[PDB]
Symmetry: T
Subunit: 155 residues, 12 copies
């Protein structure tokens, strides 16, 4: 069946490309936070184990919201290590850093996701894709809130 | 008591007219989804019975949200067979189609509501009615997602 | 697959014809109660807004219960504006009446549906259909309770 | 301690005999549906595994209800293989049918239970035992609804 | 506002009279059960304390269901020590019986309400009050089940 | 087994006598409030029906708490229409008054229970019984709050 | 840590300034609604006590959402009587008005917050801060709906 | 599809054979427990009625666990009166024992299922089937706990 | 309607005057704790953010309990910035102090509320008001527990 | 940080010393009840196993409430076998008594805790500590209710 | 702090190496199950979307249980694309297979993970690590159940 | 009644002796953790107060599982300060250690319970008591997981 939601094929494919990067960054942050949750140590273990659990639990939902938006625009949602590594703008971390470096990286992750989100809006201004704009707007709100809480731990 | 929400009377009347149409399309789709939930048969009875239940349940909430916005703008919400049939752009189905054709009509229902939502946006760009704009955007998001799920059944 | 529930096909069609009138009446009362919920104003707004919401919530379920009984007898459940307008004995209200008149029209609604339920018990006395009789009895119980609560407001 | 619930020893013993058969048929249908739940296969596995789960879960509650009604009349509830075999009018399936055949057997089982229920009403239209009559009506309504949904799968 | 439910004044008044006696018996049983809940002692304290709690908590809900049927019929529901003492057929226990005598009196209290409900049916066999008939049926069901669990303890 | 809770037997019998009068007054208000819930009419039906429901639901818990203190003191809790009529200081309403009169009677009822509770403190100053004193205090708190809400309706 | 969320310091500070005024108006409406909840009397006590409870409960959540947006932007959230009095545009009520005047002031309060939200959009017109714009939009949605329900009581 | 879980076809069938005797004993215990729940009488009625309910409720879930493991092993789960009467080692009981006898038989029932579970372990010590060994362990745990509770009643 | 709860008008006005200061202190501590929740930073952000949330959430319930006690005494509850600034003994914090200093101030706030509560008991000793005494006792219990938890952080 | 709750240090130490003895008696009673829970046998096993579970579950919360008041008073709460053996006035049972003797010991233990609580009131009359007095009063209420329930079993 | 759990460091690092491959396999099957949930199409969309959702949601919890057993053994848990790509015996799928092939790959996945788990039992035999043994037994049980449900769709 | 569960008297008594040691260490760790919950102070008060609460809460369910295993084996469960002091290997702490020392001591406690569990495996692998073996395995999993979380704070 045809897709007649008021956005053309070329435009939907361009939007699904931007959301593919958003999905990649969000998944990479998800896995990193999940990593730090398991591996953080030190006097802040109890509070960071719990904080990081709240964050990756939220990001597991966020990846679903973004993948389902791509599917609604008529495109397959990427979902492999290789696809995400190619699309992610987020530097992975292969070691076990100190808790304060874990905080600092999670802050930069949040702001990396915000950067990818903002990069997509210019595309949307020419088109009218109002649902996608609102998904970006919600992801931005969540990540900027999480950044304040994470960096507060460092002031 | 006068209404001072930052939008004048003529303009609030025009937005309510547009949302009256949205309300009529959403109600007409609700009743058709409800109709197909009762009447669908075949090997996909169970899966479509359940699927259309989730959709008409969602749409019953949506008709309240659209009608409450009309009231917040200062106008009565339409609510009769005669008013919805006059205002609706959705084609009614008086018979009992095959399951696949039920699916196909409900895809075009989703897209018909999105088209009605898109037609109201020029009016909000000339004024500023940000709450109504967000309402339209949430409806488009729901309908576009439901359209992907429905037509995936037809691949 | 044939139907062997101890009621013949033309006898089940007769029961379904009456249930289709009960359904059309129940669904017209649903949408009118829903209408009045949105549209009532005045000093009784809070209490009536809430009272009508409880009623139309109950009636969205009753609509399903009646429709599924039609399907259990082996006939399609009607589900369109034209079908309900044809089969309904409840006259719609196309405008916005004062709250006391809304109350009055809904009392008479309740008593209308009780009449239609009662119009079916002759048929069931000839044809033994004890589940359908229980359904009619439950609808009468609810509509009579509701008429008491409604008319208590006018005493 | 004596029993004075308005129904004499002889009649309670009769109604109890009917319910003993209703119980045996409901329990036989219970185990058959449970069987088919575990054992069904093919591309409708997800649907039928779930549908038959809901039915056997309901039927577990039904056997309790029926057994307690027998205890209220003042007689023991049958509850052994030998007693259910002898009292049952539903034949069990000792092998593993194909999915469509499982459906057909379950439809027929619903109808067998409905038949056993009617067989009890005459015993009641002579006496006055309105609680037992309501129990049969409820069982009849559940099994006829289930019959519709099961047979809808074979259209 | 006139009451138009298909029963009409003097019939409704007779049924209300019947239901008033059922309410008085039910409230009288509710209080006696409450009383025995507080006051029972001996090695069966815990199980009877809890069992009579289940019963009076149920009866508290039943007095509401009965009262509201009197009101849907259009008559005031009785609610004083004098109205109930006049209308009730249960003998009140002003002292503190042994546990086995409490059980025995509660059994007879159940059969007292069934007996009062049976008294009322003939008058429905004339009028076609199906909701009231269904209320009487549910109360007979509960008291008959409760009689079995109570007298089981004496065996 | 003997009772050794720091209060002699005739002193516990005097406290229990005072609490029996409190139970009788609270039960009488329970049933009067319950009566008025069923029977109130007028434009305040919905709000008084609901307000009186909250009150009798709370009072049903109160009668259990008071009865159980009598039992903890080693004396039986009264629980018959005759004992409560002998013990209570509140008068029942045998008719159906207007809603404003219903409100006024319930105000005076709360204030009557407060007085009965006050009347027991001189005893408790002679006899140390801190749990009972806290029970009286809690009932005084509830009835004074409830008096405020009721009498606000009359301002 | 630096804050890199795609908005510069001086724009973040100007936006936090506007949100501080929104927070002040929202907290002042919170306390006013809370006050009226406690203090309202007359025949509408029950429905207005409840309605204002719903509003102040919602506003308590809203002040957290607004304050946390100011924090996410990197500035302190104001939280004292003096700071809110300085920034607020709502006129406080030091007495206890009649119920209808309470409703009227709460309508004007809703319209006051909406007005303050609007005054911030031209500054998000220069810098792109979509999360803040969606917050304002949600607050406008809530207050325009609440104004409808409040005004309706005065019709 | 090939079943490739590291157990050979003949070994799985011998495991399934063992599990099938377990299922038969559990199901026979389930129905005997259910039966005794319905039929026990005397002073211990409430405590045993409830005790056996918790037991049969647990057993209803165990039969599902056993059956699903047989299917995980690639074999049909048995599900008839005949297949269970043949595989079960549990003396069925066709009358109504005194409560002490009922408790005794249920104790032997527990130990019988334990004996059957132990009889499968030699087979398990020659084949790597750790999940099946875990299922036997959990069943042995439940039945030995239940044995203690039931025989404590006879101390 | 006249208030007859056993306390004269001027004696109630004096109790209400003391509870009005307790309310202003409790409310000022509410806003300060809320303020500190939003604005605290450093390595104890997560733990203090959460702890202060639990506190301001509790205090919001407390201000309702105190304000309802004033209404039960027959006087209006204060509820403005100017009333609370006038009646409060707790000074507000207009800046953003260090985490340690926030903790210290909240310890001192708890202790200030205990002194205001304590200050009211001499009036209650002259005027019997046991409910108010219980209210003050409960606030003292909570603030003393909270003070332990806060000052433990500084050991 | 200093403690200023209006009680001097040696006076708090005296209250804490009383509460430490209450804690030790509550904990000793907790473990004894827990032990009897596990070990009781005979025809009352089901009812006493459950009753004792209710009791030890309540006492576990009590030991927390008592310990936290000691901490609010500024002193360490005891918690070792040696500390409780020293401070406790309740003797432990090293064996396994007959059920009737378990009930007796638990009655005695309830009354033992009441006595320990009573004994702290002279101190509280000389130094004002209203929270602790309330705690003692609640403990006395709970243990007096429990002693009624327990000793009713021995009548 | 040193680790003294009865398992030397050499043996712990070897169990950790095994558990890391299990984690990498469990994670890869997690993301692949997640990927197919978003991307499956055709007439089995509803049933598979849901069935896969249930699978990856379970798998998300399994990766936590596994990573945390690694931590309890005292080693870091891998958590990056490179580490899982390196350790994973599960084969990536970079495109969009037909529904039947998705089912096929997921059966393979379940079996691969059972393979990795079985591979580790030698170490736990040599050692005694009963907690890790129980984790592998639980994963094998889950994945063998899932393979049954998946492959049943293809029968 | 005899005990026949596949293990002889002498063998079970030996298992009950080792589980008595396990119950004593587990109860001793429970009280010690509970003590440290009340008594810990310093900047980690909040996280340790909460972490120790989750642990003592878990252990309270453990001692029930161990005591009931002993009962199922046919032996009385030990339950006194002297019994546990005799059988326990945990060193009791009579002081109030600094927070870091409390953590260290609870680590050692976890490891101590593991030791007692391991010591039981040689027995029972001479018998075949798999329920007991699985009980030991569950406790080892919890204590080893908890030991990781505790020692992470000391890193």
């Amino acid at each position: 069946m045809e897709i007649n939601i008021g956005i053309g094929e070329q435009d939907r494919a361009a939007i699904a490309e931007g959301l593919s990067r958003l999905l990649a960054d969000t998944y990479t942050l998800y896995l990193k936070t999940h990593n730090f949750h398991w591996n953080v140590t030190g006097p802040m273990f109890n509070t960071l184990h719990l904080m990081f659990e709240g964050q990756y639990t939220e990001l597991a939902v966020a990846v679903d919201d973004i993948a389902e938006r791509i599917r609604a625009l008529g495109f397959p949602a990427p979902g492999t290590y290789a696809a995400y590594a190619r699309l992610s703008s987020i530097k992975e971390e292969e070691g076990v850093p100190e808790a304060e470096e874990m905080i600092r990286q999670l802050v930069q992750g949040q702001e990396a996701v915000v950067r990818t989100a903002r990069s997509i809006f210019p595309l949307l201004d020419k088109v009218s894709d109002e649902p996608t704009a609102d998904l970006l707007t919600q992801r931005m709100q969540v990540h900027e809130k999480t950044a304040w809480m994470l960096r507060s731990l460092l002031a």
